[PDB]
RNA sequence: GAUGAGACGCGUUUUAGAGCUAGAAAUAGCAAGUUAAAAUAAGGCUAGUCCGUUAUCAACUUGAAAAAGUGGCACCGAGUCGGUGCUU
DNA sequence: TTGTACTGTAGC
DNA sequence: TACAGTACAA
């Protein structure tokens, strides 16, 4: 009657067993649907769930930000065709649409195949005067007499298309782009962060050494030669290594222990910073920061070369010089590997492929590629001395558009074209009308705020409209409702409160917040409070020596101290309340109590907003307070996330006895100290009461609300589908209690608990008719390793049953607290049936992989657009199969034409599986099938099981792919070996427990001899693999006299040849396996396709042989 | 630890940037190369400077969909479950 | 002309 | 890890 459900969540697979209260599985003959001979099979109520593991929402992110990203450059494209086309009308008819058409093959290209004149003659007189853009960018810039309107637009298209960052607010000026002024904020934060042996740099000079054009290593020796006190490997040469984009190890100068490494390297904009931060600690992010603006300036300079004159367009003229000194040395480097090395003349310049200079620009060779294949031949060849350096200072040969190009501002493309616009002004009147439009196009950014400028149709917008009309860079002002819009951003970014989730969480800068991580670690009140007004508010890093100096010693006269609570200094600060104190300079202003709401709001604003729009709003409303300079400084400072608690929690609720707040507790607790987590915890204390009341609030609005990874929520969401079909099994009769594995414990014991129990009455709140049992993973690996019911992963997948077993008997023994229970556990754990089931998914994501593949002659290339042949325009390979679909008609076969009829699987892509199922008998007469027999369309998805002779069963990849579906049961002896084979020297256990398990595997060794025979047997019977057979057998037999350690582990490996799923590479002692690959899915037209549920116990049988 | 907004620079793809000489040639020698346009998931309609890779998904019967419903028990054994006995 | 075998490919 | 490209058996 009474039974047990035992249950083992992971990321991709959920276990589950049902047991009585005598610990044992029932068995069951369960029914069986379908056109199959068999009527009832009997099964077990064991088994596990398996499957791809869920995704992050990041990816689909990043992908859907590229995508507006390109939709609004085409569009900031179209603003400025719209400005150009009435005037460009008069001058050419058809610029703009040999500009859109120049994709195309000429026999697709309606008009010229030259885009700009549209005559050969001009377009070699334009490439010859200009043979960059950046040559008619200068001109433009350079030019007083009446130019061509068409290169003008040539010109503004290429600014306003690729306009640079955004990195910078504000015009530029030096105190922000010189080198020497954010080298100088570097080295004061890096006096600010330690304040303890600090380095001063007044009389030095950045711009002569950091701009000096020299090899990197060069430059830092030098550097560091500048200053006795710092070495190469310190941690300012450790920062100032970043800030030249080396690789430094930030670990050695922290002494972590695992290796992090930091490189702003051209797609990895500092994110990688996440992983040493999460260890170092946040106050050194701002160090790092700026020294990531330091490269910024160092990159800006070394490409703006030309700024030493003030005679033209910087950025145009130094790409100029680049093209020209790239020709004088080419020329050279051409004849000195002719003169004297005519051998690889050709496999450099002319073979494209083994990154020579044809493979540089030719070929995918990058720039490092190709100084390093060069390298060697320059060490080589003589007179190559002037040119190495160039290597040595990355310089040689350098390109116009590189992976550098992302440390320009957009304020240079604005002045360059600001320049342009004045230059031409009288001469075209429209220009003149024009120019704050063009320069609004090219300097207008959508703000952190406002998000996506949707009417309603979006996910993602909260924008608000105060109107109804399109949006335009030069009317966004008057149609954005700003304060509403700016209002939906807080209400939006707001995290909540894990304690009180109703809470909006405090800024991690907040200043109260400050206050609760420093006196959280102290009580690890009057002592507190004098320590707190002495040290803390007054320097920002306070270590032991200065407590015992300069309050112990100083106030309370004590000589020797000892304090053991803190060992070197204190992790948190108030460094926000320094901060403040440094901007307003009005100390006493804090001290008031009132102010405290205005200080915590404009912490808050700058933890909202990076613009200076709505920040100039939000804090304009407290000038009554303060003015002037104190505004002008703080309108400059930002912060960056969030704190645990709310605002609501810290200081907000209040204890129903004691009339303390957390905070309150936390300053004054009489006579001894007490901590955060035990003031939660503490009975005495209604914040307990409070918090376990006010935690809890569908499924759904459980699983999306909670805090998690989908990878742990797509468990959670089958293992309470696996309990929903287990309660369905047994009669819909409810277990007497639900066993579950290890926070998200009391999460997802709610979500059980709140299933099953859906009863109350007047006096009992909650009737327990089921009890959801929580039970933490050492318990069970303990009960496992010390009564020897060993586990391995590699043998089957049947670990997660026989874990979701242990779990309910241990839970069961657990909560109704050696002989038969031995006997059937271990009975239980060496029993064969177990239903694993590999969960069927349509598969969704991109419907090909991204690598745009070159022109062929093959049908196989898939169109990148509707009208682009891919036989001429190249275009995407290797298609993503949602699912197959299993088609019988007729196809037209033979020269002579006869209809054959045909049965084959045929997979439906991504792409084409909307198209399939608005029409699927329309799809299919397209491909060629006619005569279809519609309602013998079987859908299948991946994973899809077919049992085949001899118990022969095969998962359906894709439409031309199997997999391996059979489960080798092991005997729990077997595996009980192989477990205490491996591992024989690192139990650390006592040496008696040691010794009997070393006899136990020493006096059975034959039992390996019978184990590779177990492989042979099962691999011969289902796996079909005899070449592969026949390589491990003889393998082994070579390899019989190597001891136990090497060989129990290799035939540990050697179990991928039977485990399910793809066939994978294992390897031996020193021979590696080629996996035997399934492509072909013609021996499933007539096997028996299996429709599992999800706990597999009732099945649907359907003989393919038997259709068509 | 989840989620979201705004931006940059590469890369790839086709085309434009007239190749010359010896050549019956399959080709050989030389010259040249750095840039730009267009696309960057096919596309969708409520046509927005929006949306399109996350999450959900065994089979059958109802239901536009949502959603609901659909499958006997005990014992003896074990090569992916078998056999025996009651029951409608 | 249709199936198999072996090796190579895949955005940041 | 499924698909692509080349290379053979009929």
Known sequence: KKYSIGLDIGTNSVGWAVITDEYKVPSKKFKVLGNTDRHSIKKNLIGALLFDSGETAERTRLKRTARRRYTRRKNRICYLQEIFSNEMAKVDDSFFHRLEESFLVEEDKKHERHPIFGNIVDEVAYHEKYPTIYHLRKKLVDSTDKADLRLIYLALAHMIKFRGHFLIEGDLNPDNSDVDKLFIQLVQTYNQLFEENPINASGVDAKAILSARLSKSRRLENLIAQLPGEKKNGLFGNLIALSLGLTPNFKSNFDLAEDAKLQLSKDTYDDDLDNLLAQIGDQYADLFLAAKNLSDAILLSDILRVNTEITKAPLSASMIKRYDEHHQDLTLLKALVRQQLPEKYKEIFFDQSKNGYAGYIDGGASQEEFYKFIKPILEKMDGTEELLVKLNREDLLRKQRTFDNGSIPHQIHLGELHAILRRQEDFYPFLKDNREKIEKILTFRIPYYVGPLARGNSRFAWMTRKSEETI??????????????????????????????????????????????????????????????????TNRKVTVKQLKEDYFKKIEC????????????????????????????????????????????????????????????????????????????????????????????????????????????????????????????????????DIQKAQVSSLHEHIANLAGSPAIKKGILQTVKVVDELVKVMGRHKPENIVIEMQITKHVAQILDSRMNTKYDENDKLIREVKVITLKSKLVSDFRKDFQFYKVREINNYHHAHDAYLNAVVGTALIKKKGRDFATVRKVLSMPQVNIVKKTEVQTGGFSKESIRPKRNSDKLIARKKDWDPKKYGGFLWPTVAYSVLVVAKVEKGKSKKLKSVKELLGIT???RSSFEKNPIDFLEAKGYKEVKKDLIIKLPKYSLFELENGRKRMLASAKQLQKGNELALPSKYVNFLYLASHYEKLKGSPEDNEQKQLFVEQHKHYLDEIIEQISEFSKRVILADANLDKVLSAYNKHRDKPIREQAENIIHLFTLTRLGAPRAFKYFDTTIDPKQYRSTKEVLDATLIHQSITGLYETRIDLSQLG
């Open 910 to 912: 991504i792409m084409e």
């Open 558 to 689: 004590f000589d020797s101290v000892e304090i053991s609570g803190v060992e070197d200094r204190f992790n948190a600060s108030l460094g926000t309340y320094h901060d403040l104190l440094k901007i307003i300079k009005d100390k006493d202003f804090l001290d008031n109590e009132e102010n405290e709401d205005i200080l915590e709001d404009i912490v808050l604003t700058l933890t909202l907003f990076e613009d200076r729009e709505m920040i100039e709003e939000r804090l304009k409303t407290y000038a009554h307070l303060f003015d002037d300079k104190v505004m002008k400084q703080l309108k400059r400072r930002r912060y960056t996330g969030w704190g645990r608690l709310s605002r609501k929690l810290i200081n907000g609720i209040r204890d129903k006895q004691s009339g303390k707040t957390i905070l309150d507790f936390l300053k004054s607790d009489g006579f001894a100290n007490r901590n955060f987590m035990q003031l939660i915890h503490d009975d005495s204390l209604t914040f307990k009461e």
């Open 472 to 537: 335009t860079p030069w009317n966004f002002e008057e149609v954005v409702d700003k304060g509403a819009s700016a209002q939906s951003f807080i209400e939006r970014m707001t995290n909540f409160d894990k304690n009180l989730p109703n809470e909006k969480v405090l800024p991690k800068h907040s200043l109260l917040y400050e206050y609760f991580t420093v006196y959280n670690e102290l009580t690890k009140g009057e002592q507190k409070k004098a320590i707190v007004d002495l040290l803390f508010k």
